Design a protein around this ligand. Sequence first.
Ligand code: ZN
Ligand code: ZN
Length: 273
Amino acid sequence: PTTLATACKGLDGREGWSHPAPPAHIYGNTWYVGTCGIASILVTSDDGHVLIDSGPADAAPLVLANIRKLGFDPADVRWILTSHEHHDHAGSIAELQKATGAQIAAVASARQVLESGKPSADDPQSGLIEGFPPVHVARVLVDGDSVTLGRLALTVRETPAHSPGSASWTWQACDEAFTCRMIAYADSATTISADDYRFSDHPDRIARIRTGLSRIAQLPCDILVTPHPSASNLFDRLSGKAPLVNAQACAAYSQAAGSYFAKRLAEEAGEAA
Ligand SMILES: [Zn+2]
Ligand SMILES: [Zn+2]
């Protein structure tokens, strides 16, 4: 009787990223096991589990504990996946992997950063953002691929709105009464950069953004979940304060991110004196 929502009140910002949160149940075989600021998703089967995102570089033990505190063995997670290739979300993929033995799978657009720890030359945020400890990508994926673990099937989309390597994930979950819902772990969708960076000068990046917004908006999406919980109002929805199921969430979320992006392009235009 503790609640993610009240347990993390006021910790949406930086203070929360490495700040411990009680694990929670999202739906069916899917569990929140991240911190107050950064999500980490556990997807369970008898055949083994899948885990998405590590949280910041120092957060490995926090989520390792949230796993056990739920009655699951971290030795049972067979795959570690990622939303996108920034330290706050993947910063301890490495430590999380050797503490678990899992293999790592990722979209090709992310592989280079993941295997080097340095953000991509195409990332609007380098070299503002910092790096994290590298990892070897065992299975490198293409848009529409499926990570399969027994009857588990997590299917990935390249969604490059926020970074070049951004990925969004989708899978089915069913409650105790065999009501089934599609969960969408839709990546951060914010178009943000270092100061000197201009999207107008990078048509590749702009075209990839449009592709990502379009794919995010069309994900099968009964239950939206975001690498930053507040981006999808996740703690209130998990804590009965707001509706957990809303099949229109991904569309609205993408529409909003796209609205933000257009304001940013307009700002860059009006800097053309
Ligand atoms: Zn990021
Ligand atoms: Zn983030």
